[PDB]
Short mmCIF file of all heavy atoms in Angstrom, two decimals:
data_model
loop_
_atom_site.label_atom_id
_atom_site.label_comp_id
_atom_site.label_asym_id
_atom_site.label_seq_id
_atom_site.Cartn_x
_atom_site.Cartn_y
_atom_site.Cartn_z
N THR A 28 6.02 2.13 15.03
CA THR A 28 5.93 3.58 15.02
C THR A 28 6.07 4.06 13.58
O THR A 28 6.31 3.25 12.68
CB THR A 28 7.06 4.22 15.84
OG1 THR A 28 8.29 4.09 15.12
CG2 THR A 28 7.19 3.53 17.18
N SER A 29 5.94 5.37 13.38
CA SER A 29 6.05 5.96 12.05
C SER A 29 7.41 5.64 11.42
O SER A 29 7.53 5.56 10.19
CB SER A 29 5.84 7.47 12.12
OG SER A 29 6.74 8.06 13.05
N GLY A 30 8.42 5.46 12.26
CA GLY A 30 9.76 5.13 11.80
C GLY A 30 9.89 3.73 11.21
O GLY A 30 10.98 3.35 10.76
N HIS A 31 8.80 2.97 11.21
CA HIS A 31 8.75 1.64 10.59
C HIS A 31 8.18 1.60 9.16
O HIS A 31 8.13 0.54 8.51
CB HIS A 31 7.95 0.67 11.46
CG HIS A 31 8.65 0.26 12.71
ND1 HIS A 31 9.51 -0.82 12.76
CD2 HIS A 31 8.58 0.74 13.98
CE1 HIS A 31 9.96 -0.96 14.00
NE2 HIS A 31 9.41 -0.03 14.75
N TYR A 32 7.70 2.74 8.69
CA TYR A 32 7.26 2.90 7.30
C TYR A 32 6.31 1.81 6.79
O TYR A 32 6.45 1.36 5.66
CB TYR A 32 8.49 2.98 6.39
CG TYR A 32 9.40 4.15 6.71
CD1 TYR A 32 10.30 4.08 7.77
CD2 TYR A 32 9.34 5.33 5.99
CE1 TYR A 32 11.13 5.14 8.09
CE2 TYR A 32 10.16 6.41 6.31
CZ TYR A 32 11.05 6.30 7.35
OH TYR A 32 11.87 7.37 7.68
N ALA A 33 5.32 1.42 7.60
CA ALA A 33 4.38 0.36 7.18
C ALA A 33 3.86 0.54 5.74
O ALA A 33 3.42 1.64 5.36
CB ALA A 33 3.22 0.27 8.17
N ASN A 34 3.94 -0.52 4.93
CA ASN A 34 3.33 -0.55 3.59
C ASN A 34 2.24 -1.61 3.53
O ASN A 34 2.35 -2.63 4.20
CB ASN A 34 4.35 -0.92 2.49
CG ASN A 34 5.57 -0.04 2.50
OD1 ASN A 34 5.49 1.13 2.18
ND2 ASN A 34 6.72 -0.62 2.85
N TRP A 35 1.21 -1.39 2.72
CA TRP A 35 0.18 -2.42 2.53
C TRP A 35 0.02 -2.72 1.06
O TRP A 35 0.08 -1.81 0.22
CB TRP A 35 -1.17 -1.97 3.10
CG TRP A 35 -1.17 -1.85 4.59
CD1 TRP A 35 -0.81 -0.76 5.33
CD2 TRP A 35 -1.54 -2.88 5.52
NE1 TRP A 35 -0.92 -1.06 6.68
CE2 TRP A 35 -1.37 -2.35 6.81
CE3 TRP A 35 -1.99 -4.20 5.37
CZ2 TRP A 35 -1.65 -3.09 7.96
CZ3 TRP A 35 -2.27 -4.94 6.52
CH2 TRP A 35 -2.10 -4.38 7.80
N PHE A 36 -0.21 -4.00 0.75
CA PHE A 36 -0.38 -4.46 -0.62
C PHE A 36 -1.64 -5.31 -0.73
O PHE A 36 -2.02 -5.96 0.23
CB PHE A 36 0.82 -5.31 -1.03
CG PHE A 36 2.15 -4.62 -0.86
CD1 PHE A 36 2.81 -4.63 0.38
CD2 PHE A 36 2.75 -3.98 -1.93
CE1 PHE A 36 4.05 -4.00 0.54
CE2 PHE A 36 3.98 -3.34 -1.78
CZ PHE A 36 4.63 -3.36 -0.53
N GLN A 37 -2.27 -5.29 -1.90
CA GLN A 37 -3.47 -6.07 -2.14
C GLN A 37 -3.17 -7.10 -3.23
O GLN A 37 -2.63 -6.76 -4.28
CB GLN A 37 -4.58 -5.13 -2.61
CG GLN A 37 -5.88 -5.79 -2.99
CD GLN A 37 -6.83 -4.78 -3.60
OE1 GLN A 37 -6.49 -4.10 -4.57
NE2 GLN A 37 -8.01 -4.65 -3.02
N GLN A 38 -3.53 -8.36 -3.01
CA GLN A 38 -3.30 -9.36 -4.04
C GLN A 38 -4.42 -10.39 -4.21
O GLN A 38 -4.88 -10.99 -3.24
CB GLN A 38 -1.99 -10.09 -3.81
CG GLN A 38 -1.83 -11.29 -4.74
CD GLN A 38 -0.42 -11.80 -4.81
OE1 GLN A 38 0.32 -11.71 -3.84
NE2 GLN A 38 -0.04 -12.33 -5.97
N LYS A 39 -4.82 -10.59 -5.45
CA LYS A 39 -5.80 -11.61 -5.79
C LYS A 39 -5.11 -12.78 -6.49
O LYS A 39 -4.20 -12.58 -7.29
CB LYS A 39 -6.89 -11.00 -6.67
CG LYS A 39 -7.60 -9.85 -5.98
CD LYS A 39 -7.77 -8.64 -6.88
CE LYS A 39 -8.33 -7.47 -6.10
NZ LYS A 39 -8.80 -6.35 -6.96
N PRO A 40 -5.55 -14.02 -6.19
CA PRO A 40 -4.90 -15.20 -6.78
C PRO A 40 -4.67 -15.04 -8.28
O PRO A 40 -5.54 -14.54 -9.00
CB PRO A 40 -5.89 -16.32 -6.48
CG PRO A 40 -6.54 -15.90 -5.19
CD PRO A 40 -6.66 -14.39 -5.29
N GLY A 41 -3.48 -15.45 -8.73
CA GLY A 41 -3.12 -15.34 -10.13
C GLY A 41 -2.99 -13.92 -10.65
O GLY A 41 -2.91 -13.72 -11.86
N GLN A 42 -2.98 -12.95 -9.75
CA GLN A 42 -2.76 -11.54 -10.11
C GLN A 42 -1.54 -10.98 -9.41
O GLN A 42 -1.16 -11.44 -8.33
CB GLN A 42 -3.96 -10.67 -9.76
CG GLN A 42 -5.22 -10.98 -10.51
CD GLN A 42 -6.12 -9.75 -10.60
OE1 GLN A 42 -5.64 -8.62 -10.71
NE2 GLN A 42 -7.43 -9.97 -10.56
N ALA A 43 -0.92 -9.97 -10.01
CA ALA A 43 0.16 -9.27 -9.36
C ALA A 43 -0.41 -8.54 -8.13
O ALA A 43 -1.51 -8.00 -8.18
CB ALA A 43 0.80 -8.29 -10.32
N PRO A 44 0.35 -8.51 -7.04
CA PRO A 44 -0.11 -7.64 -5.95
C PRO A 44 0.04 -6.18 -6.39
O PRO A 44 0.86 -5.91 -7.27
CB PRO A 44 0.88 -7.94 -4.83
CG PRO A 44 2.13 -8.32 -5.55
CD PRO A 44 1.67 -9.10 -6.76
N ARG A 45 -0.78 -5.28 -5.84
CA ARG A 45 -0.68 -3.85 -6.07
C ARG A 45 -0.36 -3.17 -4.75
O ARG A 45 -0.92 -3.56 -3.72
CB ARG A 45 -2.03 -3.29 -6.57
CG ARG A 45 -2.24 -3.31 -8.07
CD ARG A 45 -2.43 -4.71 -8.62
NE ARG A 45 -3.05 -4.66 -9.94
CZ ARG A 45 -3.21 -5.71 -10.74
NH1 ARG A 45 -2.78 -6.90 -10.36
NH2 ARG A 45 -3.78 -5.56 -11.92
N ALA A 46 0.50 -2.15 -4.76
CA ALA A 46 0.75 -1.35 -3.55
C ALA A 46 -0.45 -0.45 -3.30
O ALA A 46 -1.00 0.09 -4.26
CB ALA A 46 2.02 -0.50 -3.71
N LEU A 47 -0.85 -0.30 -2.03
CA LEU A 47 -1.96 0.59 -1.64
C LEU A 47 -1.54 1.72 -0.69
O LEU A 47 -2.03 2.84 -0.80
CB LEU A 47 -3.10 -0.18 -0.94
CG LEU A 47 -3.81 -1.29 -1.72
CD1 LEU A 47 -4.95 -1.88 -0.89
CD2 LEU A 47 -4.33 -0.74 -3.02
N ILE A 48 -0.67 1.42 0.27
CA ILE A 48 -0.33 2.40 1.32
C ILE A 48 1.16 2.37 1.51
O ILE A 48 1.76 1.30 1.48
CB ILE A 48 -1.00 2.04 2.67
CG1 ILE A 48 -2.54 2.05 2.54
CG2 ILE A 48 -0.46 2.94 3.83
CD1 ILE A 48 -3.13 3.44 2.36
N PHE A 49 1.78 3.54 1.69
CA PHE A 49 3.19 3.56 2.12
C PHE A 49 3.38 4.57 3.26
O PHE A 49 2.50 5.36 3.53
CB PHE A 49 4.11 3.88 0.93
CG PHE A 49 3.93 5.27 0.38
CD1 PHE A 49 4.87 6.25 0.64
CD2 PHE A 49 2.83 5.58 -0.42
CE1 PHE A 49 4.71 7.53 0.13
CE2 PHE A 49 2.67 6.86 -0.94
CZ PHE A 49 3.61 7.83 -0.65
N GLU A 50 4.53 4.53 3.92
CA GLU A 50 4.79 5.42 5.05
C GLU A 50 3.60 5.45 6.01
O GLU A 50 3.16 6.52 6.42
CB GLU A 50 5.10 6.85 4.57
CG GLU A 50 6.50 6.99 3.99
CD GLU A 50 6.73 8.34 3.34
OE1 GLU A 50 6.16 9.35 3.80
OE2 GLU A 50 7.49 8.39 2.35
N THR A 51 3.08 4.27 6.32
CA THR A 51 2.01 4.08 7.29
C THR A 51 0.63 4.55 6.85
O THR A 51 -0.34 3.80 6.97
CB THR A 51 2.35 4.72 8.67
OG1 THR A 51 3.65 4.28 9.07
CG2 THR A 51 1.35 4.29 9.73
N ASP A 52 0.53 5.77 6.34
CA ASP A 52 -0.78 6.33 6.06
C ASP A 52 -0.91 7.06 4.71
O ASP A 52 -1.95 7.65 4.43
CB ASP A 52 -1.24 7.24 7.22
CG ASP A 52 -0.39 8.51 7.36
OD1 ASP A 52 0.49 8.74 6.51
OD2 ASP A 52 -0.61 9.29 8.30
N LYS A 53 0.12 7.02 3.87
CA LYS A 53 0.10 7.70 2.57
C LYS A 53 -0.47 6.81 1.47
O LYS A 53 -0.13 5.62 1.41
CB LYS A 53 1.52 8.14 2.18
CG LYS A 53 2.17 9.11 3.17
CD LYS A 53 1.24 10.30 3.46
CE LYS A 53 1.88 11.32 4.41
NZ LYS A 53 2.11 10.74 5.78
N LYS A 54 -1.29 7.37 0.58
CA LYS A 54 -1.92 6.60 -0.49
C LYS A 54 -1.30 6.92 -1.84
O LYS A 54 -0.67 7.96 -2.01
CB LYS A 54 -3.43 6.90 -0.56
CG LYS A 54 -4.17 6.77 0.77
CD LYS A 54 -5.66 7.03 0.64
CE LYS A 54 -6.28 7.20 2.03
NZ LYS A 54 -7.78 7.32 2.01
N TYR A 55 -1.50 6.02 -2.81
CA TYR A 55 -1.17 6.32 -4.19
C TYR A 55 -2.38 6.93 -4.89
O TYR A 55 -3.49 6.90 -4.35
CB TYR A 55 -0.70 5.04 -4.91
CG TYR A 55 0.52 4.43 -4.27
CD1 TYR A 55 0.41 3.40 -3.34
CD2 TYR A 55 1.79 4.90 -4.58
CE1 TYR A 55 1.54 2.86 -2.74
CE2 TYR A 55 2.92 4.37 -4.00
CZ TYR A 55 2.79 3.35 -3.08
OH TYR A 55 3.94 2.83 -2.50
N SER A 56 -2.18 7.46 -6.09
CA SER A 56 -3.28 8.04 -6.85
C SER A 56 -4.29 6.96 -7.25
O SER A 56 -5.42 7.28 -7.61
CB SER A 56 -2.76 8.72 -8.11
OG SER A 56 -2.26 7.74 -8.99
N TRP A 57 -3.88 5.69 -7.22
CA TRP A 57 -4.83 4.60 -7.55
C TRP A 57 -5.45 3.93 -6.32
O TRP A 57 -6.23 2.98 -6.46
CB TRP A 57 -4.18 3.52 -8.44
CG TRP A 57 -2.98 2.90 -7.79
CD1 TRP A 57 -2.97 1.86 -6.89
CD2 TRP A 57 -1.60 3.28 -7.98
NE1 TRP A 57 -1.68 1.58 -6.50
CE2 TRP A 57 -0.82 2.43 -7.16
CE3 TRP A 57 -0.96 4.26 -8.75
CZ2 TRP A 57 0.57 2.54 -7.09
CZ3 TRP A 57 0.42 4.35 -8.69
CH2 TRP A 57 1.17 3.50 -7.87
N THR A 58 -5.13 4.42 -5.12
CA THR A 58 -5.67 3.81 -3.89
C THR A 58 -7.08 4.31 -3.60
O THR A 58 -7.27 5.50 -3.41
CB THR A 58 -4.81 4.18 -2.66
OG1 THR A 58 -3.43 3.89 -2.90
CG2 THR A 58 -5.31 3.42 -1.41
N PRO A 59 -8.06 3.40 -3.54
CA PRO A 59 -9.42 3.87 -3.24
C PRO A 59 -9.52 4.56 -1.88
O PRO A 59 -8.90 4.10 -0.91
CB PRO A 59 -10.26 2.59 -3.26
CG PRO A 59 -9.50 1.64 -4.12
CD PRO A 59 -8.03 1.97 -3.89
N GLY A 60 -10.29 5.64 -1.81
CA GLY A 60 -10.49 6.37 -0.58
C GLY A 60 -10.98 5.50 0.56
O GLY A 60 -10.76 5.83 1.72
#
């Protein structure tokens, strides 16, 4: 549920992962539409 605050991250081998989504459906300014 929303109370679980799902986050999503993207990672490519040999690269740092980047955060994409937080609080289930919220994006960062760098998250592609």
Side-chain angles (χ1 to χ4, degrees):
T28 73
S29 55
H31 288 273
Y32 300 80
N34 306 291
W35 293 87
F36 305 85
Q37 176 188 55
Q38 171 164 31
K39 301 134 187 193
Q42 295 206 35
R45 271 71 161 172
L47 299 183
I48 298 290
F49 66 105
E50 285 172 33
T51 310
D52 67 5
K53 299 309 182 294
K54 309 182 193 186
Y55 300 96
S56 69
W57 59 84
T58 308

